[PDB]
Every structure is written in structure tokens, then in C-alpha cells.
Amino acid sequence: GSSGSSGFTCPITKEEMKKPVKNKVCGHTYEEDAIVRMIESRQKRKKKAYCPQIGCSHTDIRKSDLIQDEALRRAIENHNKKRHRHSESGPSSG
Ligand SMILES: [Zn+2]
């Protein structure tokens, strides 16, 4: 599986990811708010959470099989540290 050499985009929200969550069933990775808003948006519509990753065949995802991937977490931070978007925040308490 390969999408981008440098960067992480959620196939659902279609935006940068900050909290990558890996599944125990399949293994793919998605955004927290994404996998959280999806499962809640599906159930309410009498639906099921399926691998949103365009290309997968699986269609069985459970909130219980959702974990916080560290290997990916520290990775994303490695790019964010670069600081090339805002670079203008002087908070009194950090
Ligand atoms: Zn998958």
C-alpha cells in the first residue's frame, strides 16, 4: 500500500490527518474524527463501517478494533515540525 511519499490524507474527510488509527481486522489507517464520525454516521443510517480506503475489499470495521498507531503518529509530527503553514503563534502558555 502506497499513496504519498510524504504526507497523509484521509480518504473520508479528504484532508491532512493528525490522529492515525489502525484497524486490527484489516490494518489500514484513517483519521480519528473520520473513523469516529463515519461509524456514527453509518449506524444512525442502519449501515456498517467498511474499509473507506479506495481499493480495499473488506467491509467489516468495529470501533473496538480501532487503535492509535504510534509509528504513524510520530511520523506525521516529523513533518508538522517543519512549520511551513502558519509560523506565527506566540501563546502565553504552551
Ligand atoms: Zn482495508
- The secondary structure of the chain as a DSSP string is --S-SS--B-TTT-SB-SSEEEESSS--EEEHHHHHHHHHHHHTTT--B---SBTB----B-GGGEEE-HHHHHHHHHHHTT--S------S--
Spatial neighbors of 49 by CB under 8 A, at least 6 apart, are 35, 38, 39, 42, 60, 61, 62, 63
Q: CA 82, CA 61: separation in Å to the nearest integer?
A: 34
CATH superfamily, with its number, for domain 1-94 = Zinc/RING finger domain, C3HC4 (zinc finger) (3.30.40.10)
Q: Which of 33, 28, 22 is nearest to 73 (CA)?
A: 22
Structure determined via: NMR
Instruction: Give the Å distances, CA to CA, from 90 to 18, 81, 86.
Output: 21, 16, 11
Residues 50 and 28: beta-carbon distance below 8 Å: no
Q: Which of 30, 37, 36, 35 is nearest to 16 (CA)?
A: 30
- For residue 41, the CA-to-ligand 1 centroid distance in Å is 19
- For residue 81, the CA-to-ligand 1 centroid distance in Å is 29
In the chain, domain spans: 1-94
Single-letter amino acid code for the residue at 85: R
- For residue 86, the CA-to-ligand 1 centroid distance in Å is 34
- For residue 50, the CA-to-ligand 1 centroid distance in Å is 8
For ligand 1, a single-atom ion, the residues with CB < 5 A are: 26, 28, 51, 53, 56, 58
